[PDB]
Amino acid sequence: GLKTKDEVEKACHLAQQLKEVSITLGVIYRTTERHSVQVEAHKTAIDKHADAVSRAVEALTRVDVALQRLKELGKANDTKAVKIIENITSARENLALFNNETQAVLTARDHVHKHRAAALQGWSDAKEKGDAAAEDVWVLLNAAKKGNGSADAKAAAEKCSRYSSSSTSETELQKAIDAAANVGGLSAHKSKYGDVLNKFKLSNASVGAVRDTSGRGGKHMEKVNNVAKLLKDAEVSLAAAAAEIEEVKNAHETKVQEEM
Amino acid sequence: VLSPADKTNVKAAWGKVGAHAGEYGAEALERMFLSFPTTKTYFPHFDLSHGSAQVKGHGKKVADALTNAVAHVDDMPNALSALSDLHAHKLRVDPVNFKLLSHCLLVTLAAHLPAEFTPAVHASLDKFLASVSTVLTSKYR
Amino acid sequence: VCGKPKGSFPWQAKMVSHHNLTTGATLINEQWLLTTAKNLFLNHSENATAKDIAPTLTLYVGKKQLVEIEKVVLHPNYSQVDIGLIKLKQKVSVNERVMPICLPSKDYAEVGRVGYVSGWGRNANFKFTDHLKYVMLPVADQDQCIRHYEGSTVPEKKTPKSPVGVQPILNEHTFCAGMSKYQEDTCYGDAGSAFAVHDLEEDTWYATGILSFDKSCAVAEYGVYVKVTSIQDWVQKTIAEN
Amino acid sequence: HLTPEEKSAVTALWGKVNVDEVGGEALGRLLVVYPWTQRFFESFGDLSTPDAVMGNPKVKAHGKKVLGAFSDGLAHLDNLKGTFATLSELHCDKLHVDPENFRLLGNVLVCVLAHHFGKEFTPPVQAAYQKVVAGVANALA
Ligand code: HEM
Ligand code: HEM
Ligand SMILES: *[C@@H]1O[C@H](CO)[C@@H](O)[C@H](O)[C@H]1NC(C)=O
Ligand SMILES: *[C@@H]1O[C@H](CO)[C@@H](O)[C@H](O)[C@H]1NC(C)=O
Numbered sequence: 001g002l003k004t005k006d007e008v009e010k011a012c013h014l015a016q017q018l019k020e021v022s023i024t025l026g027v028i029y030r031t032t033e034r035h036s037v038q039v040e041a042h043k044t045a046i047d048k049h050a051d052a053v054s055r056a057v058e059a060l061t062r063v064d065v066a067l068q069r070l071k072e073l074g075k076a077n078d079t080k081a082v083k084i085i086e087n088i089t090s091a092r093e094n095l096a097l098f099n100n101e102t103q104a105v106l107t108a109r110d111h112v113h114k115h116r117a118a119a120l121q122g123w124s125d126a127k128e129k130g131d132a133a134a135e136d137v138w139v140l141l142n143a144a145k146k147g148n149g150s151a152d153a154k155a156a157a158e159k160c161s162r163y164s165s166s167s168t169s170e171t172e173l174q175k176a177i178d179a180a181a182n183v184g185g186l187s188a189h190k191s192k193y194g195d196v197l198n199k200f201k202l203s204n205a206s207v208g209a210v211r212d213t214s215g216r217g218g219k220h221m222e223k224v225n226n227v228a229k230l231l232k233d234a235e236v237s238l239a240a241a242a243a244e245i246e247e248v249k250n251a252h253e254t255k256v257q258e259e260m
Numbered sequence: 261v262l263s264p265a266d267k268t269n270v271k272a273a274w275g276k277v278g279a280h281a282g283e284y285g286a287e288a289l290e291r292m293f294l295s296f297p298t299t300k301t302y303f304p305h306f307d308l309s310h311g312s313a314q315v316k317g318h319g320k321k322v323a324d325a326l327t328n329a330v331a332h333v334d335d336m337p338n339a340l341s342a343l344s345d346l347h348a349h350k351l352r353v354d355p356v357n358f359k360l361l362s363h364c365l366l367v368t369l370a371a372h373l374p375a376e377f378t379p380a381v382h383a384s385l386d387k388f389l390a391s392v393s394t395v396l397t398s399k400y401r
Numbered sequence: 402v403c404g405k406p407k408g409s410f411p412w413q414a415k416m417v418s419h420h421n422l423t424t425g426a427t428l429i430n431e432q433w434l435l436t437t438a439k440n441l442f443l444n445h446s447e448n449a450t451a452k453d454i455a456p457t458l459t460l461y462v463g464k465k466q467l468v469e470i471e472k473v474v475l476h477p478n479y480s481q482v483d484i485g486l487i488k489l490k491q492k493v494s495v496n497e498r499v500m501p502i503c504l505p506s507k508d509y510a511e512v513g514r515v516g517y518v519s520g521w522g523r524n525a526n527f528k529f530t531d532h533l534k535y536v537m538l539p540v541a542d543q544d545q546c547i548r549h550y551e552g553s554t555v556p557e558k559k560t561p562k563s564p565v566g567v568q569p570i571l572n573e574h575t576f577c578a579g580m581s582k583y584q585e586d587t588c589y590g591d592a593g594s595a596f597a598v599h600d601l602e603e604d605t606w607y608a609t610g611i612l613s614f615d616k617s618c619a620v621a622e623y624g625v626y627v628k629v630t631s632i633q634d635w636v637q638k639t640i641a642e643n
Numbered sequence: 644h645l646t647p648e649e650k651s652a653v654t655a656l657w658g659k660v661n662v663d664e665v666g667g668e669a670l671g672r673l674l675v676v677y678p679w680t681q682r683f684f685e686s687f688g689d690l691s692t693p694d695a696v697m698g699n700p701k702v703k704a705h706g707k708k709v710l711g712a713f714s715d716g717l718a719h720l721d722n723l724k725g726t727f728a729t730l731s732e733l734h735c736d737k738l739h740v741d742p743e744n745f746r747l748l749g750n751v752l753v754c755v756l757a758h759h760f761g762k763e764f765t766p767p768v769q770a771a772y773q774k775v776v777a778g779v780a781n782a783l784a
Contacts, residue, residue, distance in 0.1 A: 022686065023737050030682055034537060037515050037582060041539045045513020048542065124686040163733055218601050221513065261564070261622055291766045295773040310766075337566030344566055355527040355589060363750055370757040371764050379675045379693045382754065386676050391564070393527070394620040397589070398565040401422075401443060524743045525677065534741060583679035 001185055002140050003149035005156045010179045011144075011186060012160040014193075015137040017176040020168040021196055022127035025203050027167065029123050032116050032207055035214040039109040042221050046102050049228040053098065056231045059238035060095060063088060066245040075252045084245045091234045094227050101223045108217030115209040122203030129196045133189060138162075140185050170204070173197050262387055267333050269384035273369065273376050274330045281327055284368050286319025291364040299357055329392055340395045348399035355400060358393035365389060402495075403430070404503035404606035410519035410533065412502035412595060412608070414468075417459040418443040423521050423529045425593035427608060428462060428501045431492040433640055435611050436593035437627070438479035451475055451485075460487065463498035474639050476632065482574050483613040484627055486639055502595055505607040508630045509598040510576040514540040516598050516609060518578070518624070522591030529590060536585045538578040538596070538624065540609075546577035546623045569614035569625040574632075576610055577623040586619035587612060596626050645720055649771035656760065656768060657717055665759065666710030667703035669752040671696050677747050683740065713752070716779050727782035734783055742784035749776025 002008045067085070070076040144157040177193045180186045262270070277284060292299050293308050293315075300308055307314045325343060332339035347353045366385060370377045404412075414426040414434055422443050426436035441454050451473040460468050469490045476484040493499050509516075519535040544554055550569055551559045561568050569575075578596060580586050587594075596610035610626025617624050645653065674681050675693045684690070687701040696702060712730060719726040734740045753772050757764040 023733070026683065026686065027738070029685070033582070033682065034515070037537050037539065040582075041513050041515045044539065045511070048512050120685055124688060127686050161729065163729065163737070167737075215601070222602075225511075225513070261620065287766070291769055294766045295770040337563065341566065355523060359527040363753075366754055367757045367764075367769060370754050371761050374758050374761060377754075377758055379672050379697055382672060383676045383693070390618075391620050394616075394618045395566050397527075398567045398616045400589070524741075526743055526746060528743070530741075530743070532741060581679070583682060585679050 001149065002144040002157070002183070003153055005150065005152040007183050007185075008141065008144055008153050008156040008160070010176075010183050011137050011141055012156070014176045014180045014186065015134045015141060016161065016164040017168050017173050018130045018134040018137065018193070018196060019162060020164040021130035021173065021200055022123070023163075024167040024169075025123040025126055025200065028204060028207050029119055032119060032210045035112055035210050036116055038214060039112045039217060042105050042217060043109055045221070046105060046224065049098070049102070049224060053095075053228055053231040053235075056091065056235040056238050057095065059235065059242040060088065060091060062242035063238075063245055066242070066249040069249050070245075070252065073249075073252050073256060078248055078252065080248050081245055084241050084248075088238060088241050091231065091238055094230050094234070098224065098227045098231060101220050101227065104220040105217055105224055108213055108220060111213045112210055112217065115206045115213060119203050119206035119210060122199050122206055126196060126199035126203055129192065129199060133192045133196055136189055136192075137186065168200075170197065170201055173200060262333060262384075262391060266384040266387055269381045270330055270333065270388045273373065273381050273385060274327065276373050276376050277369070280372070281323035282316065282320035284319075284365070284372060285321075285323035285326070286316045288361060288365040288368045289315055289319050289322065291367060292361050295364065296360045299360060302351065302353060302357070326392065330388075333388075336391055337395050340392070344396050344399055347396045348401075352400070353397075355393070355397040358397060362386070362389040362393055403501045405604075406500065406606060407497040410517075410535065410597070411463070411496075411498050411500035412597075412606075413519045413521075413533065414460055414462045414593075415521045416440060416593065417461075419457040420444040423590045425520050425522070425591055425612070426460065426487060427593060427595040427611060428493065428499070429504060429608065429636070430501050430640070431495065432489045434460075434487040434489075435595075435608070435629075435636070436485050436487060437483045437611065437613055438475055438485050439483055439613070440593045441473060441475065441485045458487075460489075462493060463496070466493075466499065468493060472643070474643065476635065481570065481572060482627060482632060483570055484611065484632055486636065488643055502597060502606055502608045504629060504633055504636065505598075505600075505609060507600075507607075508628070509600070509607060509609040510540055510626075510628050510630070512540050512542050514598060514609070516540065516578060516596040518587060518591070518594055518596050518612060520587060520591035520594040520612070520615075522587060522594075522615060523589045527589075536581050536587065538581060541577045541579045541623055543577065546625070547571055549622055564621040565616050565618065567616055569616075571625060574628055575613065576626050576628055578610075578626060579623060580619060584619055586617050587615050587624045588618040589615055591615040591624075645771060645774060649767075649774070650720060652768050653771050653775060654717060656756070656763070656772075657714070660710075660756070660759070662710060662714075663707065664703075665752075665755050666706030666708070668697070668706070669748065669755045670706040670709055671699075671702050672751045672755065673744075673748050674702070676751060677744070680744055680747075683738070709748075713775075713779060716775065716782075720775070720778070723778045723782035727779070731783050742780065745780035745783045746776070749780050752776065 002011050067076060067081065070078060070081055141157050141160055145154055174197060177197065290310065328339055329336050369385065412428040414428055416424045416426050416436060424440040424443065426434040428434050442449065445454055455470055455473040458470055460470060462468055471488045471490040474486040476482045515537060517535050517537055519533055521530055521533065524530045547554050550563045550571060552562045553559055592612045592615035594612045595608040596612065597606050598609045599606055608629050610628055612624055613627050614625035674684065674690060674696050681690055687699055689695045689699060715726060716723055753769060753776060756772065
């Protein structure tokens with residue numbers, strides 16, 4: 001049992017830090033909500049972009065199907081077809097960029113959710129473990145208020161608050177665990193303490209990953225926004241190109257019919 | 261916003277209330293007056309004693325209005341337009357009071373229809389009364 | 402200087418009407434705030450002038466720091482653009498709790514954008530909040546919002562469809578924002594507050610909108626904001642002239 | 644402040660509460676009715692549906708703790724401030740919980756009591772419990 005003022009103070013500090021784990025982590029976890037909101041906003045914006053560029057995409061598809069027919073007729077080398085293809089190559093390049101950047105945004109969105117789910121699970125495990133370990137320490141602290149053991153040990157136990165004065169950290173929790181290694185009664189739970197600290201680190205690191213991933217996602221989204229506008233702006237000229245190449249293709253069809 | 265699922269919950273809970281609506285309205289007012297005495301200031305000329313006939317009369321009008329809103333959940337602003345001008349402009353009832361009466365109505369329903377007052381129904385009714393409260397206060401200035 | 406918060410919404414101000422109704426205003430430089438024309442007209446006749454209004458207002462910033470007002474300037478087309486400017490008698494002292502938000506050069510009122518709206522409006526119990534709160538909201542599709550309140554984007558097909566029984570002012574000068582992930586919305590007294598967007602490249606906060614329609618209260622689905630880019634020139638001219 | 648008569652009606656009622664259940668049911672309902680409160684409790688696992696919420700063991704367990712603190716408040720109606728000073732320090736200073744949520748939980752608890760006690764949850768007993776929930780909310784703030 002805890003019989004000295006020193007043992008009581010080491011136990012007190014540890015119990016506070018173990019109990020603080022869930023509190024600190026809930027606060028830290030709640031900072032990831034902005035990133036979940038942002039990544040959901042990226043997805044909505046991508047769906048809106050995909051809709052806005054669909055007419056430009058439809059024109060580019062019409063161009064490829066007219067070109068495929070020209071290849072079948074052996075007329076794909078027609079100078080007008082060649083010229084049209086050159087004129088639309090920026091749009092083809094922009095469409096490939098739009099596809100690539102949107103995919104990068106969507107992967108970052110998946111990673112944000114995955115890191116957030118690991119942060120949540122880490123928080124939940126840390127709380128389960130932390131609260132239980134703090135309860136075992138409190139058995140000793142509460143017993144230390146009565147019976148044998150110095151009057152100073154009892155007074156210190158009576159003064160002990162459930163809660164830490166500030167947020168915990170890997171450093172502070174570790175410091176508390178290490179100080180308690182000297183205390184007989186607490187020493188039986190050393191492996192429990194270690195698992196709490198590993199869950200704290202894991203949750204915290206996952207929160208860091210959410211933030212970094214979200215930043216990368218945002219950079220990709222800025223490129224998506226830029227290239228989506230270039231495609232929408234090209235819509236009218238792309239529709240014109242699709243009609244011209246269809247005319248070229250139609251003239252070659254009628255030249256083949258008339259030549260048979 | 262009331263979802264279709266909320267609307268179903270409200271129509272069912274209020275269908276169980278049925279003919280008791282006036283009695284429940286009178287009890288919600290009685291609970292409001294007693295729990296939150298400041299509300300009594302809007303009714304300076306009422307007999308607000310337990311069992312007052314004037315309160316039973318008013319409870320019936322309040323209930324009829326809610327019944328009407330339940331019947332017209334998709335068009336509540338329209339169904340409550342006269343009442344909304346009445347409360348916001350003429351009477352100038354501070355919005356806080358609507359949350360007091362809403363709480364007291366929920367308490368009344370919980371006490372009288374325990375079988376129906378599930379968590380989902382409680383969420384739906386709170387949302388329904390919040391829509392009524394908002395409609396009745398949106399013109400307040 | 403602007404848009405670098407250390408406490409989280411140092412640009413937020415609290416306006417109190419002569420009949421003790423709390424509303425919002427937003428600090429845009431050391432001596433001027435944006436708010437709405439509706440806020441300014443609380444407890445006034447529809448025929449009041451800026452001169453009638455100004456001496457009847459009480460304004461605070463930071464930790465209950467009362468600031469004295471010199472004058473008010475109503476937007477010349479305030480029935481379309483629900484805005485007013487407030488000029489203080491003197492510059493505020495900038496610190497960790499009091500700092501203007503930047504006015505934007507870019508138009509951040511696009512779907513895919515998330516904003517933070519702080520406010521002194523009424524809470525879930527319809528009481529004016531004791532503590533400043535905020536909501537994180539996404540910019541919503543303009544057409545979705547128009548259909549929600551007006552039924553159609555086509556003028557001849559419009560009908561008053563507002564779920565709260567009062568219609569917002571919706572036009573080319575405004576944007577809408579949704580509701581939070583946890584279905585939190587804005588409500589009475591939140592108007593005048595900024596829809597603040599964080600530009601991650603510059604690491605600066607910008608006022609993208611000023612909340613106009615603060616009556617949605619999670620009953621109607623969208624808050625309606627005046628686009629700051631659409632009034633920027635008028636703001637600059639007004640400040641330069643007064 | 645509670646008349647001794649009110650203190651009496653309150654403890655009389657409380658003595659009959661299922662200490663193992665009404666805590667989880669009030670917390671469970673707060674999370675369903677006012678979903679933004681979940682952000683403090685996402686660590687409880689599955690809260691995706693009202694049944695998931697109401698049947699969740701962590702909600703039940705945590706509920707017991709909340710109810711236990713209300714029980715302590717009942718034993719010290721004269722000094723709620725001192726009784727709740729440590730808890731206020733946690734919720735206020737560490738957690739930054741908007742004090743309006745304490746009033747919402749208190750009100751949900753009143754609804755739960757009404758739900759379980761029916762008619763016995765009379766208007767005067769409600770009014771006494773409203774003093775308790777306000778007192779507990781102010782002390783936590
Ligand atoms: C769900 C909320 C409410 C509903 C449905 C409701 C409904 C109405 C109805 C139907 C009337 C009667 C109109 C008539 O005289 O023909 C009215 C009158 C009135 N209401 Fe409300 N009301 C509500 C909330 C409020 C609240 C919260 C208060 C104040 C605390 C308020 C105070 C009054 C007063 C003072 C009158 C006028 C009394 C009279 O002269 O008859 N009510 N109520
Ligand atoms: C008004 C009545 C309330 C009572 C009596 C109450 C009671 C308490 C008690 C006794 C604990 C401490 C358990 C412990 O860790 O040793 C606590 C913890 C907590 N409460 Fe409350 N509470 C109330 C309202 C609130 C509300 C409204 C919220 C937020 C929505 C809140 C969120 C929390 C959180 C997050 C914890 C910390 C759990 C942890 O991580 O350690 N509760 N509750
Ligand atoms: C409300 O406004 C009036 C003055 O019009 C006055 O009673 C007081 O200044 C305000 N009330 C409170 C409680 O501050
Ligand atoms: C006010 O409205 C008219 C409408 O045609 C417009 O020409 C004018 O520029 C507007 N003023 C400002 C400052 O926006």
